[PDB]
Structures are given as C-alpha cells and as structure tokens.
Amino acid sequence: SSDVTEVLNYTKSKYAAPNPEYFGKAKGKNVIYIHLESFQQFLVNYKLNGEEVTPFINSFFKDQNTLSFTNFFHQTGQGKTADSEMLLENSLYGLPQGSAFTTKGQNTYESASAILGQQGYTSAVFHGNYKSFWNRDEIYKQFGYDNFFDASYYDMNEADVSNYGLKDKPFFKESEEYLSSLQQPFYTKFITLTNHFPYPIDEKDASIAPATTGDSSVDTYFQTARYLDESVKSFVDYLKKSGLYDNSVIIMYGDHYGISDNHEEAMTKILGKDYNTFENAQAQRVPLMIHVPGVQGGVQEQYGGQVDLLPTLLHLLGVDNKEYLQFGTDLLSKDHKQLVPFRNGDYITPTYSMIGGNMYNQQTGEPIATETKEMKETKEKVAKELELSDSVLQGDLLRFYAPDGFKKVDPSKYNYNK
Ligand SMILES: O=P([O-])([O-])OC[C@H](O)CO
Ligand SMILES: [Mg+2]
C-alpha cells in the first residue's frame, strides 16, 4: 500500500527512457534466451595453449548484428541459478540469504512471460532436468510461463545423462521438435546444465585438453566450456536452418561465476596477474550478447547488471515498462547509470568500487583508505535499492499493484505434466 508507493516512487525516479535508435527495433520478434551455465566473460576470446576455448561464442560476440557487453555483471546470491532467473524474469533481486525460488514460489509476479503474454506471446522454458528442482514447477506458474519442457520431455538414457541431468548436445538437439511447433511470436529460455562445478567430462566428449594449473576444477572448466560452446553452435545452426535466426532476438548470457575465490593460485596463472580480492570482483563479469536482426551492433562498454536486462529487452521490443516495479534500467539508454550493485552490498562503478566493504580505484585496482561523501552516498543508494527489492519479495507487494491495463496471471491455469 504505502510500501507499494515507496517502491514505485523509487523505480519511476530511476527509470531511463528508451533510446530512439533502438526502441522497438525488434517489435514483434521472437525471444530466444541461451543460458550459458556458470560461464564467465573472461572465457570470451580466451586462448588455452594457443587455442580458442569457445570459438563459436567468440564469433557470436563479434557478429555484425550483436550488441556485446564487456562490463556486464551477475548479481546473484545463495539462490545461484534461481537468482539469475529472478533477475531476468522480474527485474527483482534474489533474497539476501537462501533462495527466493524456494521460499517465494507462491508470490504474485508481473514477469516477462506475463508482460509479453499481454501482447499474444507464447512462453516456454527448456531444461534437461526435472521441474521439481529449484521449485521451478511452482513459481513458473506465477510467472505465467505457458510451457515448461523439463526432463520428462527428453530421452534420459544413461549415456546422455550427467550428474545434473541431460547433456547439452542431446538437450539442444531434442529441443528442436518442441521449439518448431511453438506458436510465434514466442518468448523462450533454454537453460543449459553441463557446465556445472566441478566440471566433469568424459574424455570422448572432450575436444580440448584440460588446463595445466594443478587445480582440478579450474583445469576441466575449460573442457566443459568448450563442449557447451559446441552444443550452442549446433543450436544456432538449427535456428538458421529453421529460419528462426532471422525473426528472433537471440540473447546469450551467463548466470554466475564458474570459479570461486578459493582458487587464487590457479586463476593467477589463468588470467596472468595476481588474483587478489579486486581481480576476483572483476571476474564476476558474465557475457551478455544480444543479436538483433538488421540493427548494427558493436561493443557495449557501459557498466550494468542482470537486473538491467528485462528493461533492455522490453524497450527493444517496443514495450514501455515505466509503470512496472522493476529495479533495472535500459542498458541502451543514455540515462542508464553505470552503477552495479552486488547482492552483499558491494558495488561497481567506472571510477570507484566497494569490494568486501572496502573501497578501490576501479581503473587501477589500488585500495582507497577512506570513503568520500560520494562513495558513501553510492553505498547507501545500493543498500536502499536492495532493501526495496527485498520489500517486494518479503511483503508480496505485487498483490496490491499492477499497472493500468495489465491483466494478471491465474497460476491455476498452467500444467506442465505430459
Ligand atoms: O568450493 P569452491 O570451489 O569455492 O566453490 C564450489 C561451488 O561454489 C559450489 O557449487
Ligand atoms: Mg548456474
């Protein structure tokens, strides 16, 4: 009520207006999210022993129609993969502890699948694991996802299944039948899973040798990244052959880090510089590559986070999001602020960053002993933003508010069983 009012006053004052060069430039197009599991931005153009680890994704990165972000950060917490989903579908953060998917599965949401539903978009999630995991079966219905093609829809023979479920290559290949019979325009997300810690892979599935740092999970990380790269290349081939490549916004993104801060000696070797607390913060960059048919792309260096993605996508589709309780801003807008909150209260700006609660020069990596007024102000803005987002989840505030003309999801109308 007055909680709803405080949040909307905050979000509306933050709102960044669309860029006229990009607004609606993909109106009516399909959306295909390619979820790169545990994939960090440092992998892009990375060479292991003279050899590109992820060559197809590198080519996608540089494609003429691709908007490619080099300073884009994950903003997840203990909810991990489920947190990135909360961020992408709602422009809401996960919780400061535990998993929002687990505990807020019966909250009211006004998510991307619902917003695009208003305009006749069909929606679907594809995932090679069972719908019970991370409580997806429950919360997707509140999101208004028309479909959830989970492991029940796939051939889970033991040759094709890993320890998290179906491997990416048979997953993408068996998804084609389902995607091709989905009514267009559609809104879809493909959640991959082979690239999970500690990154095991059979020798015969591996086309690249492990790194040689002596840290097992860092060394085989490159091998599962390469395998994921190859599976994604096959998927895009299908998309080109089926004609979906030309009528869809295809978005590759990473959900969270692959290597933790507990592998400093190995990551020192991998990145060629001392992997200290600052560098570890810098390693929280994940890819964001938005391929838009007919629009000139280019490298995007403006700082941003996963919270900013839904406002960015909606503006590309020609949909205005000003009245929605969403905490991110359009990444292509000139009014987008280059400020990236972490879930623990840390933050990244192009000049100064707070990392582990301490201040650093973002350009040089040098510690700054004392917070200035400006650093303190930014810190409190970040704490305020996270608190208001938490107030939406903890207060279940979307019960009490929807933008005018928005029609709400009836979650009882969805069933994902075969
Ligand atoms: O134990 P580590 O290597 O720090 O990290 C392990 C992963 O974060 C758990 O999935
Ligand atoms: Mg993940």
Numbering used by the authors: 227 to 644
Q: What wording appears in the published article?
A:
Lipoteichoic acid (LTA) is an important cell wall component required for proper cell growth in many Gram-positive bacteria. The LTA primase LtaPLm initiates LTA synthesis by transferring the first glycerolphosphate (GroP) subunit onto the glycolipid anchor and the LTA synthase LtaSLm extends the polymer by the repeated addition of GroP subunits to the tip of the growing chain. Regardless of whether LTA synthase or primase, LtaS-type enzymes, have the same overall architecture. They are composed of an N-terminal domain with five transmembrane helices, which is followed by an extracellular C-terminal domain (eLtaS) containing the catalytic site (recently reviewed in Ref. 12). Although the enzymes share the same fold, substantial differences in the cavity of the catalytic site and surface charge distribution contribute to enzyme specialization.
Next, co-crystallization and soaking experiments were performed with GroP, the hydrolysis product of the lipid substrate PG, and the structure was solved from crystals containing 11 molecules in the asymmetric unit. Similar as in the apo-structure, it was possible to build a phosphate group into a density extending from Thr-307. Additional difference electron density was observed in each monomer at the entrance of the catalytic pocket, into which a GroP molecule could be built. In all chains, the phosphate group of the GroP molecule in this second site formed hydrogen bonds with residues Ser-486, Asn-488, and His-489. The distance between the phosphorylated Thr and the terminal hydroxyl group of the GroP2 molecule bound at the entrance of the catalytic pocket is ∼6.3 Å, which is compatible with the length of one intervening GroP molecule. Expression of the S486A/N488A/H489A variant (LtaSAAA) did not restore LTA production, revealing an essential function of the second GroP binding site for LTA production.
